[PDB]
Write an enzyme that holds these catalytic residues in place. Sequence first.
Site: not given
Lengths: 297, 294
Positions: B148, B180, B230, B209, B113
Amino acid sequence: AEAWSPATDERLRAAGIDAEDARRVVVTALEEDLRYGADVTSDATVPADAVTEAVVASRQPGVLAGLPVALAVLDLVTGGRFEVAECRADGDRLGPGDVALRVTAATRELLVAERTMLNLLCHLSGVATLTARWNDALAGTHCKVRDSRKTLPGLRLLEKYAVRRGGGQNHRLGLGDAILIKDNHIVAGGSAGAALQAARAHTPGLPCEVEVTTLAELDEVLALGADEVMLDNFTVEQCVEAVRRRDAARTRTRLEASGGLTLDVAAAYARTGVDLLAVGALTHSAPALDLGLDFAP
Amino acid sequence: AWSPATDERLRAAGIDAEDARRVVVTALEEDLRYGADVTSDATVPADAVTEAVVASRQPGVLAGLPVALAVLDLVTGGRFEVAECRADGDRLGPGDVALRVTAATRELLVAERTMLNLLCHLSGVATLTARWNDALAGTHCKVRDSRKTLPGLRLLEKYAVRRGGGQNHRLGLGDAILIKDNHIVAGGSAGAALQAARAHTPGLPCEVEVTTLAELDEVLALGADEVMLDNFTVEQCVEAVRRRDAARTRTRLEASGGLTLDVAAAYARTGVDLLAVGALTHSAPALDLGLDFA
Ligand SMILES: O=C(O)c1cccnc1
Ligand SMILES: O=C(O)c1cccnc1
Ligand SMILES: [Cl-]
Ligand SMILES: [Cl-]
Ligand SMILES: [Cl-]
Ligand SMILES: [Cl-]
Ligand SMILES: [Cl-]
């Protein structure tokens, strides 16, 4: 910054999150982001001075899970130097725009925690959100949805938590806390009944379930009065037949369906009268919920 | 710890062995912290030995096979033997045998598993990246991943993105600059942030960005090394590509922001150079692979 405050632990235990396992996930997650050095962007563009307010908000609708763990990340990174204006609870539904959290902290420490907090939040919320979709396809009936051991390496206890927040029920947590006889077991045991009796004799304390792949094997374990049977890859017609034999047996075996399940056929299966659905997709193919972190202007 | 042959197979694949050890050990601890395998200890003879096949119920790209073997190596103390294996990156179809091993039956039932949760996730990631690559076929547009990732799985997930024909973006906060929206909020303006970042470490390329066509022109005016769009629409990407071709710079354009596969082939035909897709790592459906005994 070492470990977090006892306040955070009480918050995690209050939520039913295993705090030791949550520490291991959080610290591991931050190491993956910081092992190449300090945040080069922030240190160049953001004064070591700034504090901001920040809002965690959803861009789409679903169920929230992981908020105590995300706050644990921030507690660790800020060394407790943060404050919360507003929060929702795990389990709460969010539409687009809803605010799960509003916090204030050092701007640089927010930029460091952000991605780690959101990866947890978005994944656990994605799991709770999918779990809720399944549980909703089961309204009208008495059926309930369950997870499995098809979790992602390292995230089992947190994914189990997120399934609970979605209205789902946990299956066993490992190989040693419950007996589940699968096909490789019934092979070597000779029959399904031999395997069921072997497990009952060998570990009578544990809860016990046997997974069957045919109606014949279902007849064996019903005769032996199995507490719980898992119907592996049964069509909806076969489940109806399984439920008829269960209803005619001396013993009231709970029946769980597993394998070959999708969200659409879920209500058809629930209608046959099986008691449980076991869905691996809850924890291995749950799309993330889109949550984002924004600084107050 | 596992055999050093296993360490060598991992290095030969491009997998960090230290990080793969932590993932594998942690994953085993999850399954075993409650006791031995009660089910197998009651029903499977202790001397039993069996051949097992890993095969896919679905088509896709394989990734994670050296790590799955490392799990088997740990659980067996080396007492296993491989008869056949495909390589990470191979396309599988329904029925294809990715692996055929012989090991003690009880040791296979403990390992399986953990092996399959790794195999199915990483192959899921590699399979989805390959679908993105197909929709980008016929273009100079490449697909990239992001940060992410799922906690603890970053390096393995970046690996499976590469196995699926995609590029890695940066690995953490410290290996590249990426300005960002929150750096701009906490810092006045997008062009001011770019100039501050250039001042601070001049040899480091600055990706910035932007969220509007205005911001785009402002960093294009400062000769922006590389720009991330973005949440531009397909039509705003086309405008952005025009403004970039009109501006004197060779600025590279990367689009990102909620990209989904059904609009992927469209976005690749706006003339942007890259698509950064978080879905590769945070929303990759697992590839259905099972472990079956002789
Ligand atoms: O724990 C398991 O092995 C399990 C649980 C539910 C469904 N299938 C497997
Ligand atoms: O590394 C990142 O933060 C990143 C890269 C591409 C897109 N979004 C985020
Ligand atoms: Cl609970
Ligand atoms: Cl981020
Ligand atoms: Cl029983
Ligand atoms: Cl490579
Ligand atoms: Cl299993």
